[PDB]
């Protein structure tokens, strides 16, 4: 990809590094800046640098959508993101999610989704 600069010139960046994450091309929030906007506004500090080695972590919006829906027998699903393999709490506060409505419903701390067995 070639990005047009504010002074009229071109900024050639490979496609691998214009992705917002390695597992997502686009942004996941309005106020989030695209990588093209980042380079277009900060290329003076990216110029002789290696984009191979910069931080490019995976996006959770796409990893939590891979996690399958959990199913419960009732109107309530209780979520506590506990480890179950080490001592202490190590999770988020205990939350009770209503699931009577038709679709799936996510926790507010983690994005684990629950349904009413249908």
């Amino acid at each position: 990809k070639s990005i047009i600069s504010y002074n009229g010139n071109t900024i050639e960046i490979p496609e691998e590094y214009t992705k917002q994450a390695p597992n997502r091309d686009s942004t996941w929030a309005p106020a989030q800046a695209s990588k093209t906007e980042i380079y277009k506004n900060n290329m003076v500090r990216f110029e002789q640098k290696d984009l191979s080695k910069q931080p490019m972590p995976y996006a959770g919006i796409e990893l939590i959508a891979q996690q399958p829906v959990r199913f419960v027998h009732g109107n309530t699903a209780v979520c506590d993101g506990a480890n179950h393999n080490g001592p202490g709490a190590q999770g988020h506060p205990k939350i009770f999610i209503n699931v009577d409505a038709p679709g799936s419903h996510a926790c507010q701390y983690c994005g684990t989704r629950y349904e009413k067995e249908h």
Partner: protein, 244 residues
């Protein structure tokens, strides 16, 4: 006004007031319709004079207690909104307002519910808890939340999935409702658990020992060592009362 309170009134005006005062003690005048129910031999509705003894009402106007007098566990003399009475009190108690208040109970709707020794009194009181949960209007905070809490705790005390100090906790829960309400349904929901805890505490402790022996130890709230939230549910222990 109650149906009875107006239905009698023409007879009190015709027959002359002092007649109606000829019955009962000084401040507990008149006749009263008594519905006797439960574990009595011939369940009945009768009309007797006030301040009648309870043993007389049960033996003379009903069949007595099913299995003999000393097979009696307790009597609820004023409906669900009144604390239970133990056998020691019912032998020489009079069915009036004043005396039944003198034994920390009340004459309510004059509905006598008799309980045998073969029965589970904790099931009776937890069913009254479920009743007051279903019948709460849902307006003010303590009845709203506390009827549910009382039922959740009594469902566990039925099976013994609790501790011995949680009885005192439950008493404090009833006191969180017993005067902080708009209407008297909260008091009516607090009083029977108080009566149970006052007269039938070792039965509760025995049920909890039975659970500790037959199932396993327990923590505050009915939790066990293995109880965990696994996949949207509590899996490692019993959950009393959940039917949805």
């Amino acid at each position: 006004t109650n149906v009875e309170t107006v239905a009698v009134a023409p007879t009190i005006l015709r027959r002359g007031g002092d007649w109606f005062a000829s019955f009962g003690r000084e401040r507990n005048s008149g006749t009263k319709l008594f519905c006797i129910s439960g574990n009595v031999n011939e369940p009945c509705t009768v009309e007797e004079e006030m301040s009648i003894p309870l043993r007389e009402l049960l033996e003379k106007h009903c069949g007595g207690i099913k299995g003999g007098w000393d097979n009696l566990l307790g009597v609820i003399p004023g409906g669900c909104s009144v604390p239970i009475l133990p056998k020691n009190i019912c032998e020489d108690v009079l069915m009036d307002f004043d005396a039944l208040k003198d034994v920390q109970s009340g004459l309510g709707t004059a509905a006598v519910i008799v309980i045998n020794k073969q029965q589970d009194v904790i099931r009776a009181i937890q069913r009254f808890a479920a009743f007051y949960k279903h019948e709460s209007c849902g307006q003010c905070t303590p009845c709203r939340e506390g009827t549910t809490w009382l039922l959740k705790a009594m469902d566990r005390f039925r099976t013994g999935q609790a501790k011995e100090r949680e009885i005192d906790m439950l008493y404090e829960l009833t006191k969180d409702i017993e005067g902080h309400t708009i209407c008297a349904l909260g008091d009516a929901a607090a009083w029977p658990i108080q009566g149970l805890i006052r007269n039938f505490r070792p039965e509760m402790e025995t049920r909890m020992k039975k659970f500790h022996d037959e199932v396993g130890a327990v923590s505050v709230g009915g939790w066990m060592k293995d109880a965990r939230v696994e996949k949207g549910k509590v899996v490692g222990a019993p959950l009393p009362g959940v039917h949805h």
